[PDB]
Design a binder for this molecule. Structure first.
Ligand SMILES: [Mg+2]
Ligand SMILES: [Mg+2]
Lengths: 649, 650
């Protein structure tokens, strides 16, 4: 036979049985020797050509690029470098126009043209090389090629070549960005806080091992939703396999950013392409033994709430393939708030209160944007999940046992936190014991913090509270609330008869003379926002000088109604609404519950309220006699001024 | 006639009958014998005139040399004790003590007028004669009374009886936390106080009683510090415990009176705090004697030595000293956490040379021996936590996070009491108790054991330091540092014609059909290797289109060693029987058998470095350039050799 030969080539070497990739531009070369046919009369050669059967499902052949060359029969067609030099030098002569070429589906035929006498027009004694340039489609699996040499009425088959197109697709992921370093956990389908910077990971497909193609271009494109993702300009690229460049091996994982060109259109349409030096290195033989792949990390700031999708499109040899689509979600920032209530549950911001009153601070702890889908890898978990409150320790005292945290269903969950008190600075920090576990079981809702405090005795002025939420370092402050503590000043005086105008403070009281100690209570202001639950005076009498025989009265210093409607006018005797005990030389006069209830009625909040008390005594010995009264309001004691009377001996 | 003598008790200005007094008070009894009715009789018939006073010598002290008699105008009101004191001071009431015979016998003072030759008393009748008996209250309890009798010739008339009370009240000492200079509210008595803690000693005065009739002449408290344990820092403050009016201002209970207190400081050891003259004067104002008076000093000391530390104070009230109770605190040694590094067999390998894939198991002690239920929690900020920190070299080892453990001194795993925080960027792990105070009550008082296993990374070399640190409520104590070494390795691939050859054919032409060998030289296992090799193998992915392998392979010993059963192996020996071969998917894999691994981990072989050479026989099949690279796996960690190349023409 004639032994026609068939090879597949990248243009320099035999690439039979090698892996190729979408868009590869390669060649088949079929040689039909006519050396043996040079021995007969050339006029007896009336048919000469090649019928080539290729796989049009997997490769594309442009008939206008098909060529036939007349080579010296000494040329070793197996030496594909020598063939390319021969084609380039002209020692393999282009004779294509002396052939009839046809393409039909899987079939390319090249037959020599014939003279009028029927004999083929080209000389025998030469090797004729049919060159079929082809382009690999974006397909999977094998493709074979075989040919037949046609000589007059006979046919001889060539050897069969084959190439493979292994599967590999581009992909995209989302990674955390800790001060520029890439995290190692995927953030797909997770929740990213506003202003967090994250990495988009755009991963090329893999170039297969034992590569017989040529990487002519390699690029990755990412079009960003610029209303949600702000490209910061910071990016890097790494090689995912060992890559030799010049005299050095760039090991797998090494940065190759310098070899990647960025085309940035308005921070929206970003294209990363390999430069010429890198493409040249990829085409060197040792880099085709193993796989090659690369990935780009591009940094975006999340600037808007919602669901944010990302996709990339990989260009390999002009063949575009889109990756998977990744999504992340961005919630509204937390909106923690602060309020102040009284003991009845009523809101009393800006309200005036008195010693011993309960100021119940109620805060919302807003964890609606932090739940099981949170991107924990974006934060330093050790910074904790906490709530902080800065109260005025010079004016209020927290009831530490009653600090509670409740969830949105009203369930006490205080036991999930450690509570740290800083008494000197007057702050309290509530910290989740197990932050990640806490976000999983209790996140996704608003929590309610209750911080009861009590107004101190003998302080006045404005009382501020503020608070702050700290979620893994995201610090959001609440509003500030304020209460007012008007100064009070209960007084003691001395009068001869109940209702006298002339003070006897500092005056002479004779032996056997009867007189009255007079008391004026603290004022509760108009629109008082607290709740008075106790109101009394204690007068420790100097029993050797002042003799108490049970005489006392209390008078209204304001107009008010009782719960049962009965009116009380300023100056009225209301001793019926008070009680008196005398024990261990102490006169104690105490407001009844009927009087307290009256002081707390909304109907009486239009005016301020106070009362006057009188304690009847007889001076029974000589000397100087001091008197001070202790007034108790909400069980908090303060002292009147100290009065003085003189009984000379 | 008839006579009514009077007896009064005074602080010098006022009637103090029935009032409360205090140790060391300086007071006076005054007995008035009126002789106005006796002025009408013949003075020669008055032959005996005087007073016999009966006091409580068990409760007050009278010095006879201070007893005086004054001759006062009969119009002087001896009940106006201010008027009496002025008359005595000016001489308007004349001192006639020289005309009296005075005597003190136990509970009795007698003062009798002297007499002329005829027996008549030497002093004129018609005056009031005031006998003044100054006394000092002793440190006693309960009541003391005084009564006198006026003697007129053979008659006797008793005076009224006066009485005072000595209510009991002692000084005290306590110990309070010192947080940023503010005083804690929890008593640290008998609690555990770490070294370098600043605490407040609280020295509290006794109480001056309500309804006071005395005079506070001086008031001080003294504290002698043990300067080997307590370093006085120089800062202190004082508070009043009751309302104290000064001038026309009222210092309410609890407010600071430091400006009125003086500190005499002898060498930071002997501290005495005393009320200044302005405060003493305010304490004598009448309104300040109605109710109680008392004060406290807070003095700051740094605890600078371990052991049991006692403190006591001595209160000086009107020169009478009373010692307070004695408080005690305890100071244990600081924690002594340690760090060690063990290989996978459990041997300590500090300074040991190690290799890729080897386990460096860091074992640390977490010393909480001094932190138990008696700990003074009020001295620390609880938010600072209870934690243990390890800073490993993240560029050379990687931790096996799932195997981090904490155990107590009884071997119980307690890892779930802690939050484990990994910082991969700085290469640290922080182990913090979820509930720090509760954790100390439940698990404090023992030594905990922390296990942090790590593996050596592939393709790294040099020194590997590890250190750790114990943070107990802000008390930071470092462990020792351990170090390991990772000698560089360089397994290589080469090309030769025959196994023994030395002429490298890397980069040379090998003709078509020619048979040759790929040569591999393993990584070195160092002399004195401290790790453990559990896997050692090479994989060579052959270019099957060009290199034809048909089962020819050899492994040569590159060092001398011995086996478990005794067999001796020399350098250059063929040891292929201690290796196995597979040829799957064009990849030749040559693997060390367990018996060769067992050999490389024997102590007997540790004197020398160890490696091996392998040879893979191949026949070249096609023309063109042919590349070869080998991946060597050591403890399942892969690194690759140099890449060789050969050329075949035609
Ligand atoms: Mg505060
Ligand atoms: Mg580190």
């Amino acid at each position: 036979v004639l032994v026609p030969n068939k090879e597949v080539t990248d243009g320099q070497k035999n690439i039979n049985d090698l892996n190729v990739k979408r868009g590869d531009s390669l060649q088949y070369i079929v040689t039909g020797d006519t050396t043996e046919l040079a021995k007969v009369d050339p006029k007896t050669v009336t048919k000469q050509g090649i019928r080539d059967t290729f796989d049009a499902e997997k490769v594309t052949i442009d008939l206008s690029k098909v060529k036939v060359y007349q080579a010296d029969a000494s040329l070793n067609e197996k030496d594909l470098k020598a063939v390319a030099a021969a084609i380039n030098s002209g020692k393999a002569k282009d004779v294509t126009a002396s052939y009839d070429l046809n393409l039909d589906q899987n079939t390319v035929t090249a037959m020599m043209k014939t003279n009028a006498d029927g004999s083929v027009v080209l000389a025998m004694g030469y090797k004729y090389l049919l060159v079929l340039p082809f382009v690999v489609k974006n397909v999977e699996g094998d493709f074979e090629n075989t040919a037949v040499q046609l000589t007059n009425d006979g046919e001889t088959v060539t050897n069969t070549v084959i190439n493979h197109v292994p599967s590999s697709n581009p992909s995209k992921d989302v990674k955390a960005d800790k001060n520029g370093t890439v995290g190692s956990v995927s953030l797909h389908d997770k929740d990213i806080p506003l202003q967090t910077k994250i990495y988009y990971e755009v991963k090329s497909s893999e170039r297969p091992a034992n590569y017989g193609g040529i990487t002519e271009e390699w690029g990755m494109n990412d079009v960003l939703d610029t209303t949600h993702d702000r490209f910061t300009g910071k990016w890097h690229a790494i090689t995912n396999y060992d890559l030799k460049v010049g005299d050095k091996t760039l090991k797998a994982g090494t940065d190759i950013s310098a070899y990647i060109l960025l085309e940035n259109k308005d921070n929206k349409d970003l294209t990363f392409t390999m430069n010429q030096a890198l493409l040249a290195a990829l085409n060197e033989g040792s880099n085709k033994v193993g796989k090659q792949a690369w990935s780009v990390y591009l940094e975006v700031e999340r600037i808007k709430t919602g669901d944010v999708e990302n996709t990339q499109t990989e260009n390999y040899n002009k063949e575009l393939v889109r990756s998977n689509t990744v999504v992340t979600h961005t919630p509204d920032d937390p909106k923690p708030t602060k309020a102040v209530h009284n003991k009845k549950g009523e809101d009393i911001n800006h309200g005036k209160v008195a010693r011993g009153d309960v100021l119940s601070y109620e805060m919302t702890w807003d964890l609606k944007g932090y739940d099981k889908d949170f991107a924990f890898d974006t934060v330093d978990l050790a910074t904790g999940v906490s709530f902080f409150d800065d109260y005025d320790e010079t004016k209020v005292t927290p009831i530490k046992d009653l600090l509670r945290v409740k969830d949105s269903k009203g369930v006490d969950i205080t036991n999930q936190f450690t509570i740290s008190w800083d008494d000197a600075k007057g702050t309290v920090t509530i910290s989740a014991k197990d932050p990640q576990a806490f976000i999983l079981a209790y996140g996704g809702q608003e929590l309610r913090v209750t911080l009861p405090t009590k107004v101190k005795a003998d302080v006045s002025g404005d009382v501020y509270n503020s608070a702050e939420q700290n979620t893994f370092g995201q610090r959001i402050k609440t509003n500030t609330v304020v209460n007012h503590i008007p100064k009070v000043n209960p007084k003691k005086d001395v009068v001869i008869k109940v209702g006298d105008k002339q003070s006897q403070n500092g005056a002479t009281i004779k032996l056997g003379e009867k007189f009255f100690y007079e008391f004026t209570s603290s004022d509760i202001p108009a629109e008082y926002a607290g709740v008075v639950e106790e109101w009394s005076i204690s007068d420790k009498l100097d029993v050797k000088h002042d003799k108490f025989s049970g005489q006392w009265s209390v008078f209204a210093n304001s107009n008010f109604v009782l719960a049962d409607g009965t009116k009380v006018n300023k100056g009225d005797d209301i001793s019926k609404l008070f009680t008196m005990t005398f024990d261990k030389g102490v006169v104690k006069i105490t407001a009844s519950q009927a009087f307290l209830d009256a002081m707390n009625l909304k109907e009486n909040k239009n005016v301020a309220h106070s009362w006057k008390a009188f304690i009847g005594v007889e001076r029974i010995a000589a000397g100087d006699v001091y008197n001070t009264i202790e007034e108790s309001f909400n069980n908090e004691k303060i002292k009147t001024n100290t009065v003085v009377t003189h009984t000379p001996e």
